[PDB]
Amino acid sequence: MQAVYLTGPTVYLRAMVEDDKHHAAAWFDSRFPVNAARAEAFLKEKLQGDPWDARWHLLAIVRRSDEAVVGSCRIEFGKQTASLRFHMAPWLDDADVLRAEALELVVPWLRDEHELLVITVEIAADEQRTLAAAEAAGLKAAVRMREAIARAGHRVDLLIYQAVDPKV
Amino acid sequence: MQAVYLTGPTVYLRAMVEDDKHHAAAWFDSRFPVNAARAEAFLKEKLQGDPWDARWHLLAIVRRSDEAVVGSCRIEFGKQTASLRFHMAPWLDDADVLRAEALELVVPWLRDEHELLVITVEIAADEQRTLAAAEAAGLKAAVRMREAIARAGHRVDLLIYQAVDPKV
Amino acid sequence: MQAVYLTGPTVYLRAMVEDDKHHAAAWFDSRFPVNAAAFLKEDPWDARWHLLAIVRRSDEAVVGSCRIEFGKQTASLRFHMAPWLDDADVLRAEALELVVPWLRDEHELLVITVEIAADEQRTLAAAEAAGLKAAVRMREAIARAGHRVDLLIYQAVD
Amino acid sequence: MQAVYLTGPTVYLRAMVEDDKHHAAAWFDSRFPVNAARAEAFLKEKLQGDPWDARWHLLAIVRRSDEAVVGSCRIEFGKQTASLRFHMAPWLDDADVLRAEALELVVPWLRDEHELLVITVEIAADEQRTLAAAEAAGLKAAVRMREAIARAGHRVDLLIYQAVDPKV
Amino acid sequence: MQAVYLTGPTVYLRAMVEDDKHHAAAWFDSRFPVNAAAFLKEDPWDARWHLLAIVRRSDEAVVGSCRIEFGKQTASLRFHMAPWLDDADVLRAEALELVVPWLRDEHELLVITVEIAADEQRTLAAAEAAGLKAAVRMREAIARAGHRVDLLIYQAVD
Amino acid sequence: MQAVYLTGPTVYLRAMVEDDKHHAAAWFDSRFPVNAAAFLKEDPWDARWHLLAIVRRSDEAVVGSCRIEFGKQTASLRFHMAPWLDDADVLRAEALELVVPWLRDEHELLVITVEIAADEQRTLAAAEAAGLKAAVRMREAIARAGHRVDLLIYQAVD
Amino acid sequence: MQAVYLTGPTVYLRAMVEDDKHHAAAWFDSRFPVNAAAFLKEDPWDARWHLLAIVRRSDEAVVGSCRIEFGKQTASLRFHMAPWLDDADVLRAEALELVVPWLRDEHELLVITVEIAADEQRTLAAAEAAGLKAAVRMREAIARAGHRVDLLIYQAVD
Amino acid sequence: MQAVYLTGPTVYLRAMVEDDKHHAAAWFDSRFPVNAARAEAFLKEKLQGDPWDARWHLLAIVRRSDEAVVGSCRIEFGKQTASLRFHMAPWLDDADVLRAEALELVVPWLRDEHELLVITVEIAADEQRTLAAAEAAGLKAAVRMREAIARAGHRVDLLIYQAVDPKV
């Protein structure tokens, strides 16, 4: 994953390094969550494989104009699965445009460079551009988690978008 | 819901009253969660209806032999949906047998006495008897939430079981 | 405030007395708070405020409290409901419905202030019906089961 | 200390029992503090004796008119010392009058029934009646702890009142 | 708000920009908070509010923030100062001294609201000099070193 | 463990039953914990452990618990006492005094482990009298009134 | 311990010095702890323990610590890794792999104890390969992102 | 206080600046405590003066050999009083030697450059060298706070040392 270089008009993705984590410490939690996507359509357990064999990765999302790390993409591989979520810097003016571009970049890489039957992405229901990026990448809304996400004055659903190979 | 009386060989369900909540305060959290089932298959929003119109209910699960409140069933209605989860007393010797019986009791009541297109139940992957009760009630595993539930020394998946009317 | 009784269809409010506070103290012997700062020992800041018990009419149970803190110009309200209470939002909304017109028809105030959590649908609806509008919001200040909600400050200015 | 019975016009003091602690659990913390009086004039360590030999006691303060436990007096004996603090119920209308009476009752008992060279009492600077009770009992302000006590909108000093035998 | 600059003898306020927020985010990479709810990702509740950076004139350092949330009738202020800041109370008081007359001489508001901790002597003194009076008090809502202080809500009504 | 009774001058230990756990659950409906992680729903990690009630002889009250978790070679003990309990340290020390010789005279163990807070004088003294020595210390893991104390792990190896 | 160097393929351990501790202190200037009780000021309890720095060979960075506390019979280990560390579990496991044989081939101990979180797969695997077995479990004592994990105490007895 | 320069063989004291506070953020709490010395002999309130007139200062303690900030001295002036406490870096090998030197440096400065009737210093009972420095500076133990300070496995007293002008 040291070779990953996925660039668009505004941002590029590359392996997150210790330097990134340190600078972003105020908002980026380095500690491991239980998984990189909270919920998923119920499918055969075997697709995930053994926990010893799970592989976690972190990609920095880097703004081209100033080289600022503006977010991260956390990815968790199982045997035939990839699960991911994005963490954008809270100081960003419009996190959604940059998150959406990052999703456009990472999905085709995930489909091509790996042997996956399932791709699973967390996207909040108010993340318009990111939802649209997922739809154009051929992902489909699979799970609704009602009011799972705190916003100012209200809560919104967390949605889980998936592409699942026909074989499954 | 004051008329509800659903009894099996071991437990019965009736409206939870303030007395129950007070006695069970050590383990029963009276505060509202965001919903009664955390995740669900992605279906049309309209099925849930407006939040002003949502109706929440609490059923006590009562052990017949001694009249002890051994758990609760939290139910959240939307327009055409019912979502539920169980909270069993931590001092119970075998919570799963009694939870499973409670699920056997509450499901047929939910199908008959209400006009539902969707029933949604949270069940942890290690809850053997409760899983079996759900399957016999005609519910099917719809969502997997990996390692969502803390246990001693390890974590287990939360599963979401559903029955969804053909019309949907 | 000793001769004041505000009666609605479900609850009534009257001056809270020591015995009420005795029993409300246990509305905190709990591992699941909605907020932090039981009650504490009550010049100059302990002069401005006053308590009304919310009593359910059906069984005469004390089911909540309404705290009213005064400025020269002002009155600010805060509710605390028993944790085991059935239909707390309906009852709290009714108390608000009772206290606001009292503060209007029996006081001369430039500003009435009320604290209400962002998820308290019925209490919010009664505040809006009484003419109050949201003025301040404090993010994730109120604890619920597995999540937090914002505290809203509603105000009317006459 | 089962024989203690110290009564005034309004309250009496007797050994606090498990029943008291349970009822008062909302406001009374049964857990041990490090001592029963936080600060004291610096005097010879030997006066306190060994920690194995320390003896802690709890007296309930009981309102005569209704038998309500309205507070507690926590006492810590060393070899030749007695240290104490009061915890009054937060629902009390006028805690200070009842605290002050309790102090009037407990001090003469402490001087007579025990062989003390030092008595040490915590009293907040705004506790008028309690301060006056201490002065009339022949205690003197020895220590000031500035702004140690939170009140509504402001903080007040904790004062430590003492009587110390001439021999010391 | 992009062409607005309020200059006092020590600090000036101007619209906060992304770069300012970038560096202010670290005013939370800390085990010693004064409050809880770094910043979070910014319809309908994220429409009403606006940020001003407080910049120290001597070295052009961004040393704090002033958050202004609007109602139709209202404006409510909240300050956050860098944790390492020398003389934070003097600088915050000066910012208040600057923002209040701006909200008066350049807006048409019925009510101005400001949050101030009960121990912020100089900020309180500037609020009183600006005509604001305490309206609401929230006990022990602000964390300090080994103790907590109350949050006060000050208001003026024109 | 159903036919096991260890009787001392003040308390006795026997297998804990559901009814005991029912009432012990409330030893947590409280805002003042000594530790965190009421009880939780009890393969493979829920196989190794077992509970003994500590019953006060004078009134037959269940006043505490002794949790014994087993390895192939090992036994590890943890006590929880009712919060309202008079003389909890004396009673807990006596329970320890009872359980340790039982684990010796009626089991074949290479290692016995016990958790004890650093301020539990009498419990510590009984652990030392039973031949146990401190092995591990976890700083400020136990909450007391206005302070914390260390958790000590004592062990004997036969 | 000043002339002790344990070198593996990825890291090596040597006596920790003041400068290492200086920089490790910031492994706590953070709002996301894994545990509680930065470091604190170091008779009689501050006699038994000792620190080894874990240094990554590729860049000579100090990336973690190994704390060894001694009894007469005993040695107990505790690791703390830098929060930004890549592959912390692999590196920690390697340190364990290095320290255990050292405590065997260069000490005379009846019991070696190690703390390891229940989710630290590779560290657990090295403890089992070194002959250690789980002895004690403390439920949900370690904080992770949005959840907690148990702390396990592993031990070998020679 | 920008002119303060107090140097000994090992450390020097100078005004703490924002740079110091930032670097030391892991261990140095910039937030204000209620006072700089927790307890003090009970003397006339007027000596402290008005809170509006209180002046707080921070001195960095700087190790000469490497210019490292190894601690801080927090000082609070009232009208005729000075109260202080030290915060040493936790990574220090022997904090007590350097704290003690810092106390040797700051006391004569406090007596000479200011018009004080009272100097009040917090010192833990196990801080041998610091206690000895205070004694040689002509301070005397005035207050004992039993077991106020957590240490590894045990607690120690906080002591308050004072010099008080004869006039008082």
Multimerization state? homooctamer
User: How many structurally independent domains of chain A?
Assistant: 1
- DSSP helix fraction of chain A: 10-25%
Tell me, briefly, the overall form of chain A: globular
Tell me the number of strands of chain A: 9
Major sheet details of chain A: 8 strands, mixed
The interface involving the most residues is between: C-E, 27 and 27 residues
Please report the number of helical segments of chain A: 3
Key descriptive features of the protein:
homooctamer; 168 residues; alpha+beta; Aminopeptidase; eight-stranded mixed β-sheet; 3 helices; 9 strands; 20% helix; Acyl_CoA_acyltransferase (chains A, B, D, H)
Task: Describe the protein.
The structure is a homooctamer. In chain A, strands 1-2-4-5-6-7-9-8 form an eight-stranded mixed beta sheet, covered by helices on one side. In chain A, 51% of the residues are buried. Chain A is globular and about 45 Å long. The first copy, chain A, is 20% helix and 39% strand. The first copy, chain A, has a single domain (2-168), classed as Gcn5-related N-acetyltransferase (GNAT) (Aminopeptidase, 3-Layer(aba) Sandwich), CATH 3.40.630.30. Chain A has three helices and nine strands. The first copy, chain A, is of the alpha+beta class and 168 residues long. Chain A has helices at residues 18-23, 95-112, 128-136; strands spanning 6-7, 11-15, 40-41, 55-63, 69-77, 81-88, 118-124, 140-151, 154-164. Strand 3 (40-41) of chain A pairs antiparallel with strand 8 (140-151) of chain B. Chains C, E, F, G: This is N-acetyltransferase domain-containing protein. Chains C, E, F, G: It comes from Sphaerobacter thermophilus (strain ATCC 49802 / DSM 20745 / KCCM 41009 / NCIMB 13125 / S 6022). The PDB classes it as transferase. The entry lists the keywords PSI-biology, midwest center for structural genomics, mcsg, acetyltransferase, transferase.
